[PDB]
Amino acid sequence: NLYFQGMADAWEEIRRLAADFQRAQFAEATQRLSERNCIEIVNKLIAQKQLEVVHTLDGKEYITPAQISKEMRDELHVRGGRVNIVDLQQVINVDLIHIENRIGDIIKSEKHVQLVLGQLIDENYLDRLAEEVNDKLQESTISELCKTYDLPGNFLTQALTQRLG
Amino acid sequence: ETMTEEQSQSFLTEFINYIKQSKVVLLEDLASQVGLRTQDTINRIQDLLAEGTITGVIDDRGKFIYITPEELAAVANFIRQRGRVSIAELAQASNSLIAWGR
Amino acid sequence: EATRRVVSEIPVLKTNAGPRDRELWVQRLKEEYQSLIRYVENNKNADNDWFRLESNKEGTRWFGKCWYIHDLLKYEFDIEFDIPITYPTTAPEIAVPELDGKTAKMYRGGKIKLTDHFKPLWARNVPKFGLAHLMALGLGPWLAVEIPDLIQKGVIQHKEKCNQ
């Protein structure tokens, strides 16, 4: 019929919730700046030479040079000590010039990484190559390996020179 | 009609005073206190920002915010702390990075 | 696309019942206000407050204001809608009376006309969308197209209490 159990309680909640909807709309907004304004600031900081920062290719993010250096090492860590420089553009979503501008540091600073032909190779990678290579020596031609690992002879030799033992 | 160089200049005085007292200024209230169209008040303030006579930002809704140099510094540090940060994580952060009052 | 972001933040509704369900309408209305409150709080928390709203005592009539910002200026329009009998299956029709005549994407009465994409999506989500989702996916996107366009066609003009 006309009454249903709970109807009163239900409309009491609507009396409450409707008053909340008004209170909520009368409340002041948490203030934020436009994204344009955030860019405006960063552009000044750059002018005043108070900040060095690069933008992503989609123009949605900012990244410092140091963070690039760091994310470069991260990919190396992930990829296992051999990474191609060209793939870091996509990985970091920055132009390659910004990556290329950090290579000097990566090598000199860490001292743990070297550069071969558009690719960065580190101590670890080599240490683990050597292992596999011992697994031929005690069981069985750099010529061949250079071809097996697509690595220049000059390099691999010098690197193999300081491993034996 | 258009503002005598004299009148133009009580504009800037009014404006400085509002900034000194409130830091954040709603440009429709400035326009009303000086008797200008929000339109023309905003455009005037755009020229001042271009002149370097004034330092600040107008949000997308037409409120003016002066940012202090210590703020600019904090923004720089905050970007450097984060290393990578989105413009929208910035806009979010601005509520705490910036004072909205004196 | 972008939709997903706004959608995700709004709570879904559950009760499939409209104004003439003696027993279940009030439960649908509870869900309506709750979602609405949450959308407004969300809108305030980001600095994005673009409307005001009120209902009749039964939640069958709704009326209020919205505003759009274009080139740093604010344009404010009154709005209203009646809940259909076939709600929540049938979506309510929002009217901005002040633009009647002035925009092609609108029927007589001020009844705005949405894209072809709206109806199919509303329908495949029945009964989860409600008024918050109406505001978010219907009116707002409609303003984001029509208002800029009418401004650049000189069909509308900013209004200050005033004179140059």
Residue numbers in the entry:
A (entry chain A): -5 to 134, 138 to 162
B (entry chain B): 205 to 306
C (entry chain C): 4 to 167
Can you quote the paper on this entry?
We determined the crystal structure of a minimal region of UFL1–UFBP1 that is stable and catalytically competent (E3mUU(ΔUFIM)) in a complex with UFC1. Comparison of the cryo-EM and crystal structure shows that UFL1 WH1 and WH2 superimpose well with a root mean squared deviation of 0.98 Å. The composite pWH–pWH′ domain and UFBP1 WH1′ show almost identical folds in the two structures. Moreover, the crystal structure reveals an N-terminal helix (α1) of UFL1, which is connected to pWH through a hinge. Importantly, this helix mediates multiple hydrophobic interactions with UFC1 α2. Single point mutations in UFC1 (L32R, I40R) or UFL1 (I8R, F15R, Q19R) designed to disrupt this helical interface abolish complex formation between UFC1 and E3mUU(ΔUFIM) and impact ribosome UFMylation without altering the association between UFL1 and UFBP1 in E3mUU(ΔUFIM). While UFL1 α1 binds to UFC1 in the crystal structure, no clear density is visible for UFL1 α1 in the cryo-EM structure. As the composite pWH–pWH′ domain adopts a similar conformation in our structures, it suggests that the hinge region that connects UFL1 pWH and α1 is flexible and enables UFL1 α1 to adopt multiple conformations to optimally position UFC1–UFM1 for catalysis. In the E3mUU(ΔUFIM)–UFC1 crystal structure, UFC1 Asp50 interacts with Arg265 of the DDRGK motif in UFBP1 WH1′. Although the UFC1(D50A) or UFBP1(R265A) mutations do not disrupt complex formation between UFC1 and E3mUU(ΔUFIM), these mutants impair both aminolysis and ribosome UFMylation.
